[PDB]
Ligand binder design. Structure first.
Ligand SMILES: O=C(O)CCCC[C@@H]1CCSS1
Ligand SMILES: [Cl-]
Length: 322
């Protein structure tokens, strides 16, 4: 039943908007697989601090496009040596955070293309010979989700390290016949492995082609979100207290203003994954007494599996107040 979309743009902002738009107009009838390629860019996780993750002056110098995605996780640098994939599907009860199930077909395709021993590790990365060639993230909204990931074929690894504040390319591990492909050919071969065919003509009717009504709405998302300075960089947090810890589920970085024993301002940054927006947690804490019992009580009704995957409510409250 799956369909596919090959994005034509080389702009990360248009490609993310396309994914956003396709998730928001998905039918249960057909899940999608998306493939997209873009020019030098950095993509921030949903709750990351732009100013701490990127060397902005260097990105500015080199014309590296900065944006922010809807999924959690960390910062990624992409260039024309990367292809990104996305599985857009109806969310089953167990599905969110199950990177093993969602990356299985990519691993199997890569194994078939000669990259044997490729495996999932650190929960959301794909490794080969102990080295990361892919990071993955998930987003869900209203029972629909995507899992999207990078595949480093011929990324400039030096540039990755320079613009962000063990990794590897796939090319050396693939069979000889796949070792001198264009990034487009690499993408197309992956696609063919996923649908278990020899040529694209065997699945041309499974392509979904973006209409002009689609393109118009995507254009609006780029203006309002993915190219929007307010969305990308966010407002400066007002704070005198910073609490940062690494948990099983990633880093949480909390910035607080406390006055007369009450929380007046709170900003939460991190690279955790989440089904729901962190803004709801912040809204519940504003004006609350800055003490464990009062903070816990304010968050009593929240299911923390929804807000911070693999970080407990107790951990979070202790972070805020210890
Ligand atoms: O590994 C992480 O922590 C984040 C990975 C995010 C992958 C996204 C793919 C399409 S845009 S960036
Ligand atoms: Cl909980």
């Amino acid at each position: 039943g799956m369909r596919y979309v090959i994005m034509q743009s080389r702009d990360i902002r248009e490609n993310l908007a396309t994914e956003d738009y396709l998730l928001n107009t998905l039918s249960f009838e057909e899940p999608l697989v998306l493939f997209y390629i873009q020019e030098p860019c950095v993509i921030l996780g949903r709750n990351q601090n732009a100013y701490e993750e990127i060397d902005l002056a260097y990105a500015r110098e080199k014309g590296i496009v900065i944006t922010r995605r809807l999924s959690g996780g960390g910062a990624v640098y992409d260039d024309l040596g990367n292809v990104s994939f996305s599985f857009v599907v109806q969310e089953g009860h167990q599905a969110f955070g199950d990177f093993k199930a969602f990356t299985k077909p990519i691993i199997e395709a890569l194994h078939k293309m000669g990259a044997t021993g490729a495996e999932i590790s650190g929960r959301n990365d794909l490794l080969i010979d102990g080295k990361k060639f892919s990071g993955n993230a998930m987003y869900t909204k209203k029972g629909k989700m995507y899992t999207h990931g990078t595949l480093m074929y011929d990324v400039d690894l030096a540039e990755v390290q320079r613009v962000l504040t063990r990794v590897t390319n796939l090319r050396p591990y693939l069979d000889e016949k796949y070792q001198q492909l264009t990034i487009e050919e690499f993408r197309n071969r992956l696609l063919m492995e996923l649908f278990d065919v020899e040529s694209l003509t065997e699945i041309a009717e499974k392509e979904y082609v973006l209409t002009k009504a689609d393109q118009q709405e995507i254009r609006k998302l780029v203006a309002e979100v993915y190219g929007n300075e307010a969305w990308i960089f966010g407002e400066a947090p007002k704070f005198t207290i910073k609490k940062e810890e690494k948990f099983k589920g990633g880093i949480v970085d909390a910035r607080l203003t406390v006055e007369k024993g009450k929380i007046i301002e709170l900003t939460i940054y991190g690279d955790y994954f989440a089904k729901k927006e962190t803004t709801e947690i912040v809204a519940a804490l504003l004006g609350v007494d800055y003490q464990y019992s009062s903070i816990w009580q304010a968050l009593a009704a929240f299911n923390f599996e929804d807000y911070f995957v693999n970080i407990t409510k107790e951990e979070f409250v202790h972070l805020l107040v210890d």
